[PDB]
Amino acid sequence: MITAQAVLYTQHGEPKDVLFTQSFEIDDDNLAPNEVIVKTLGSPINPSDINQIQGVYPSKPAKTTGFGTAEPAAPCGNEGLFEVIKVGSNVSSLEAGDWVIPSHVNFGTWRTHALGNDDDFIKLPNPAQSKANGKPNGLTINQGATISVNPLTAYLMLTHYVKLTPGKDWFIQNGGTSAVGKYASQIGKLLNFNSISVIRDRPNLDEVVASLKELGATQVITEDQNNSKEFGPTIKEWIKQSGGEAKLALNCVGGKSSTGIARKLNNNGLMLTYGGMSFQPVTIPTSLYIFKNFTSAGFWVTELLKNNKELKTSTLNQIIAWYEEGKLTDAKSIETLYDGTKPLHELYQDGVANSKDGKQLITY
Amino acid sequence: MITAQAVLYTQHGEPKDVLFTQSFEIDDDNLAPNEVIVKTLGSPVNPSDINQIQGVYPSKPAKTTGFGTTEPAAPCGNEGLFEVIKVGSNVSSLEAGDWVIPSHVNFGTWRTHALGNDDDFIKLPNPAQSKANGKPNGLTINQGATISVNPLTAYLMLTHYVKLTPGKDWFIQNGGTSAVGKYASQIGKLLNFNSISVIRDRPNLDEVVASLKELGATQVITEDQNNSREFGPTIKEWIKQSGGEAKLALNCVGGKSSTGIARKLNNNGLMLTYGGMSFQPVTIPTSLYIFKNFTSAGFWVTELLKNNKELKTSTLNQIIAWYEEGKLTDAKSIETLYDGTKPLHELYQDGVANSKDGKQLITY
Amino acid sequence: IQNGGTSAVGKYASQIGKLLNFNSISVIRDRPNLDEVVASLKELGATQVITEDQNNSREFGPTIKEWIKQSGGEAKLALNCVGGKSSTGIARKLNNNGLMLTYGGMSFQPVTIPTSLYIFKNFTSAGFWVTELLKNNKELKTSTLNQIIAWYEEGKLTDAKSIETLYDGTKPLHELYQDGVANSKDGKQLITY
Numbered sequence: 001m002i003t004a005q006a007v008l009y010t011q012h013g014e015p016k017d018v019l020f021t022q023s024f025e026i027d028d029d030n031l032a033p034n035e036v037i038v039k040t041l042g043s044p045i046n047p048s049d050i051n052q053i054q055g056v057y058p059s060k061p062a063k064t065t066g067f068g069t070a071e072p073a074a075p076c077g078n079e080g081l082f083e084v085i086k087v088g089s090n091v092s093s094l095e096a097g098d099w100v101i102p103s104h105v106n107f108g109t110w111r112t113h114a115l116g117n118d119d120d121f122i123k124l125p126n127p128a129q130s131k132a133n134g135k136p137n138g139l140t141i142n143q144g145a146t147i148s149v150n151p152l153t154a155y156l157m158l159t160h161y162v163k164l165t166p167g168k169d170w171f172i173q174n175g176g177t178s179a180v181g182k183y184a185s186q187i188g189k190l191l192n193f194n195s196i197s198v199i200r201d202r203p204n205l206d207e208v209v210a211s212l213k214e215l216g217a218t219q220v221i222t223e224d225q226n227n228s229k230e231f232g233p234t235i236k237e238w239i240k241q242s243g244g245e246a247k248l249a250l251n252c253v254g255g256k257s258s259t260g261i262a263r264k265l266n267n268n269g270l271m272l273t274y275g276g277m278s279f280q281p282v283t284i285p286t287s288l289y290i291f292k293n294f295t296s297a298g299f300w301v302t303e304l305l306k307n308n309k310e311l312k313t314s315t316l317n318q319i320i321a322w323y324e325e326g327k328l329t330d331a332k333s334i335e336t337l338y339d340g341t342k343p344l345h346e347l348y349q350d351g352v353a354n355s356k357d358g359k360q361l362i363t364y
Numbered sequence: 365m366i367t368a369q370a371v372l373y374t375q376h377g378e379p380k381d382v383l384f385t386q387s388f389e390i391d392d393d394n395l396a397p398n399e400v401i402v403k404t405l406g407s408p409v410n411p412s413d414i415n416q417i418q419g420v421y422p423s424k425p426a427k428t429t430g431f432g433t434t435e436p437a438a439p440c441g442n443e444g445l446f447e448v449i450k451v452g453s454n455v456s457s458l459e460a461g462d463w464v465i466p467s468h469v470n471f472g473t474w475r476t477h478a479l480g481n482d483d484d485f486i487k488l489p490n491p492a493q494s495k496a497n498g499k500p501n502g503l504t505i506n507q508g509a510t511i512s513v514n515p516l517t518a519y520l521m522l523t524h525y526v527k528l529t530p531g532k533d534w535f536i537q538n539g540g541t542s543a544v545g546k547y548a549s550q551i552g553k554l555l556n557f558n559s560i561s562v563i564r565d566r567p568n569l570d571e572v573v574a575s576l577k578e579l580g581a582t583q584v585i586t587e588d589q590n591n592s593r594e595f596g597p598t599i600k601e602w603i604k605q606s607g608g609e610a611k612l613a614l615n616c617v618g619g620k621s622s623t624g625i626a627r628k629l630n631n632n633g634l635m636l637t638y639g640g641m642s643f644q645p646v647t648i649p650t651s652l653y654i655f656k657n658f659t660s661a662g663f664w665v666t667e668l669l670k671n672n673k674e675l676k677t678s679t680l681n682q683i684i685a686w687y688e689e690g691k692l693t694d695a696k697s698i699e700t701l702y703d704g705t706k707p708l709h710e711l712y713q714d715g716v717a718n719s720k721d722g723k724q725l726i727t728y
Numbered sequence: 729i730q731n732g733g734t735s736a737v738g739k740y741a742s743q744i745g746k747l748l749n750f751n752s753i754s755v756i757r758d759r760p761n762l763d764e765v766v767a768s769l770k771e772l773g774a775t776q777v778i779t780e781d782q783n784n785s786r787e788f789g790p791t792i793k794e795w796i797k798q799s800g801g802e803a804k805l806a807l808n809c810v811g812g813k814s815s816t817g818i819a820r821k822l823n824n825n826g827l828m829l830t831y832g833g834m835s836f837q838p839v840t841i842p843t844s845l846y847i848f849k850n851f852t853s854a855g856f857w858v859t860e861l862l863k864n865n866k867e868l869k870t871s872t873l874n875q876i877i878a879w880y881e882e883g884k885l886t887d888a889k890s891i892e893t894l895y896d897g898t899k900p901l902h903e904l905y906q907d908g909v910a911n912s913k914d915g916k917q918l919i920t921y
């Protein structure tokens with residue numbers, strides 16, 4: 001038997017209020033033919049995971065007694081990295097030692113172990129396998145545990161919706177220092193797309209600007225410049241002189257910021273909203289729709305890839321390859337190792353509380 | 365020779381300030397082979413005309429000294445009905461007595477007469493011609509004078525973007541008492557689409573609701589109901605019981621109203637914004653884009669038809685046929701006759717100022 | 729509770745309900761002149777008039793429950809001349825141990841009742857056919873007719889109004905009736921002489 005720990009809730013609410021830790025047993029000596037047991041290496045805290053516990057995100061795991069609670073309870077977390085420790089007599093796709101991520105959302109990754117079927121998981125290369133394959137880099141734990149949401153989001157928004165002509169066309173984004181924003185700048189560099197990042201002003205602005213330009217942003221402007229009637233024509237010139245067009249905007253902020261990035265598109269532009277900065281609706285002037293033929297749409301990676309294995313696979317492979325090749329870099333997570341000396345749910349509660357410090361990764 | 369008068373401006377601004385009447389002369393003896401002279405039968409006041417005068421509509425006629433002013437001036441009005449009074453020696457498509465509308469925007473229809481070419485005009489059947497053909501009905505002056513913008517707009521929004529299944533699917537629209545809204549309700553009825561019209565409440569709501577249902581609105585709700593969390597599930601039920609989905613929202617209002625109609629769409633819905641009430645942006649919650657896969661887009665009839673004569677002709681012929689067959693009635697106009705009691709420009713100024721009373725038509 | 733509320737039978741039911749002091753709900757199809765119709769039926773004696781959309785509505789159900797609770801009474805009888813979804817809706821509105829009488833089927837749609845009403849609410853669905861009921865029941869016919877006559881003579885009952893077409897010999901009689909059949913939707917038709 002294996003003694004595992006899982007972070008559960010029986011009722012929706014704030015994570016500080018409703019999370020608890022449940023001890024449960026996995027029988028590693030009684031695997032059905034297609035079953036696999038995995039041990040968690042690391043899982044992050046994403047806003048979607050929090051929203052899910054809060055009961056305000058319309059994709060969630062069922063509440064059940066399967067972790068040994070009398071009250072139906074749900075697990076937490078939608079992405080993470082695991083290591084296979086044992087497989088059933090009919091599993092060929094996975095082997096002990098393989099690294100895996102969940103093949104689907106709502107699996108529950110804020111826990112020490114899981115029993116599932118082989119098709120509940122997608123194999124990524126472990127560093128030993130990347131090296132054996134002659135790659136310069138194996139994946140880090142953070143890179144594996146955070147590969148499923150933010151990198152795929154950036155890549156798919158940039159390539160799946162409108163075709164940007166390499167060396168000519170532009171995308172514009174707000175939240176330029178966000179995880180997705182930073183991946184989008186790198187991917188624009190890799191694919192030869194021009195881009196403008198819009199960021200909030202700060203004391204070390206010129207420094208942040210240089211850092212984003214190194215990642216791949218062609219130009220970086222402040223939210224004040226995005227708002228600025230005076231500054232607008234300068235942006236028009238950048239795009240005009242390049243020979244291409246600003247065809248795509250990526251919005252994770254809403255409000256004035258979304259208006260600002262939409263205004264900077266050429267006619268027939270598309271905006272994708274993939275996130276929201278608390279309470280702020282997407283605000284677009286009527287004139288853009290009517291006279292510029294602007295279009296505003298959504299992006300949700302969970303829904304897009306729900307029943308599109310081929311698109312997931314192809315996108316995942318590209319992200320893995322770029323990590324192995326050293327061509328893509330993650331932002332560093334704040335990593336908190338689960339010891340057994342402190343209840344697991346408290347580690348994630350702290351992580352929720354300390355969210356603004358940076359991405360929280362609980363490790364094992 | 366012909367003494368005419370035109371409503372002109374030399375500077376953009378509010379119609380109450382910038383409009384004047386100019387008397388000018390047209391040489392009906394000195395007519396080139398391809399030329400045609402027309403007399404105005406009537407022309408409506410549309411928001412686009414007013415916006416054009418105000419300087420906030422990016423499609424307008426050149427300013428010139430052609431009407432006999434020292435300061436370069438522009439004519440007003442983009443649609444209207446004319447009678448052909450004389451044609452040149454090489455014109456075969458038109459003859460004296462024929463009804464015509466402008467073939468393009470920016471012609472100047474707030475005036476008594478015009479001199480152009482044969483290709484600046486489109487023939488509509490006059491009432492004698494409809495009767496000589498076999499039709500039960502001939503077009504009224506209002507019907508002809510308002511055929512080119514509002515009926516085409518409603519038709520194209522309902523048919524050109526998403527396919528509604530006859531007998532089950534639904535569209536929703538605000539500005540339900542507008543001329544476009546009235547055309548859209550009738551066209552919806554004719555094409556067997558279900559619809560919800562959203563209107564502002566008023567003391568005679570009863571009367572207004574009945575009128576719209578008679579036109580073809582399946583349901584009529586107020587903007588209070590549009591805003592109501594409590595009422596939302598009632599709308600959902602209407603749609604579910606029909607076996608169809610609400611796939612299309614038509615927005616000419618913006619603000620809270622636009623939010624409300626977007627929210628009533630089934631997932632994967634499309635909004636078309638074709639208008640907007642004075643300083644009030646299209647506001648959509650982030651959740652609709654992300655979780656409902658909502659799309660917000662624009663519609664501009666001028667632009668859509670600029671380089672598409674086949675679509676224009678085909679849409680136009682349907683409206684004409686429906687009028688002749690007695691299947692479509694016009695959005696009614698308040699008709700003011702230019703009979704010399706008051707100068708021409710004041711008729712249009714009064715028309716602009718009385719816009720809230722309903723659609724305004726100046727007749728001749 | 730009855731559907732086909734604008735029918736001639738529906739209009740007599742509303743009036744008879746008022747005369748006998750029964751509360752009633754009439755269900756009618758939505759129409760442009762909805763307000764005028766609702767008013768006519770309320771004046772006849774319907775306590776409440778709802779549309780078929782309201783009849784279909786799970787959201788609206790609790791409002792009807794409020795009305796009945798406030799009255800101190802129960803919805804004991806449903807009258808169905810429509811069938812289909814309409815018959816479903818009026819059945820659901822009955823209190824437990826309810827009865828429905830189907831006397832017509834104004835669309836070809838069958839009487840449709842959720843299994844749960846039968847099993848859990850002890851609902852019963854039966855038929856009504858005045859011709860069969862009165863075949864060997866001449867005393868019952870006479871008594872009923874006499875009451876209607878008396879009510880008319882007393883000014884307590886009015887007629888479901890007819891659109892009258894006079895036969896005068898210039899158009900064949902069968903064509904008057906054929907027009908009457910074709911104009912059924914406009915309302916009750918009476919050929920006069």
Ligand SMILES: *O([C]1[C]([O])[C]([C]OP([O])(=O)OP(=O)([O-])O[C][C]2O[C]([N+]3=[C][C]=[C]C(C([N])=O)=[C]3)[C]([O])[C]2[O])O[C]1N1[C]=NC2=C1N=[C]N=C2[N])P([O])([O])=O
Nearest residue numbers: 411517539541542543544564616638639640641663664665
């Ligand atoms: O509500 C008001 C009316 O419903 C409406 C005005 O109606 P109208 O008949 O004078 O105007 P129309 O000619 O029908 O269309 C005007 C709007 O549509 C746009 N448009 C039309 C055709 C083609 C194009 C295109 N893009 O191809 C565009 C045009 O720009 C106009 O916007 O407005 C209602 N109203 C007025 N103020 C309002 C309001 N509704 C909500 N809130 C406010 N502020 P009533 O009946 O008076 O209550």
Ligand SMILES: *O([C]1[C]([O])[C]([C]OP([O])(=O)OP(=O)([O-])O[C][C]2O[C]([N+]3=[C][C]=[C]C(C([N])=O)=[C]3)[C]([O])[C]2[O])O[C]1N1[C]=NC2=C1N=[C]N=C2[N])P([O])([O])=O
Nearest residue numbers: 732734735736737757809810831832833834835856857858
């Ligand atoms: O809705 C329609 C009307 O409400 C209704 C018809 O009204 P009517 O006056 O022309 O008909 P009546 O003479 O009152 O009776 C019609 C029905 O009752 C049956 N009947 C009557 C007497 C005796 C017997 C009996 N079993 O002893 C039976 C008769 O067979 C008729 O069925 O119908 C409504 N209607 C019409 N189409 C409908 C519908 N409702 C729902 N769905 C559809 N498709 P309006 O007012 O026009 O909107």
